[PDB]
Amino acid sequence: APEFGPSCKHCKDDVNRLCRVCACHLCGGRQDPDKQLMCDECDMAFHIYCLDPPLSSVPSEDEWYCPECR
Ligand SMILES: [Mg+2]
Ligand SMILES: [Zn+2]
Ligand SMILES: [Zn+2]
Ligand SMILES: [Zn+2]
Ligand SMILES: [Zn+2]
């Protein structure tokens, strides 16, 4: 559809497939989008429970940098 961006280059939006590019950058899982924190710098997303130490909730502040970018 010319009204939508093209599929993920890496997984082609196959929901049965892990993808560390468009879903959690550590586990590649798509579940819990509500719980996926996006890096202000590289735009990769991370489940709060995949981080070390894991977070039990997302921060209230908008500015967050991932393990790779810190
Ligand atoms: Mg942010
Ligand atoms: Zn993908
Ligand atoms: Zn990485
Ligand atoms: Zn994850
Ligand atoms: Zn980052």
Side-chain angles (χ1 to χ4, degrees):
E3 287 297 288
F4 287 83
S7 53
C8 181
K9 171 172 186 288
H10 190 64
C11 66
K12 308 281 201 279
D13 301 338
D14 183 350
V15 302
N16 300 313
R17 191 227 162 105
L18 297 197
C19 188
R20 291 181 179 79
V21 175
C22 71
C24 171
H25 191 57
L26 292 169
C27 75
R30 296 172 199 277
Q31 314 215 348
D32 298 333
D34 31 293
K35 285 181 199 217
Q36 304 198 18
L37 204 41
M38 189 176 275
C39 180
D40 280 35
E41 179 159 321
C42 66
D43 304 318
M44 295 295 96
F46 294 76
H47 286 125
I48 56 181
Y49 46 71
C50 289
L51 303 168
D52 181 34
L55 309 179
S56 63
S57 311
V58 299
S60 68
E61 93 159 35
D62 290 331
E63 182 210 85
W64 179 84
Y65 300 98
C66 81
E68 301 177 348
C69 291
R70 267 160 216 184

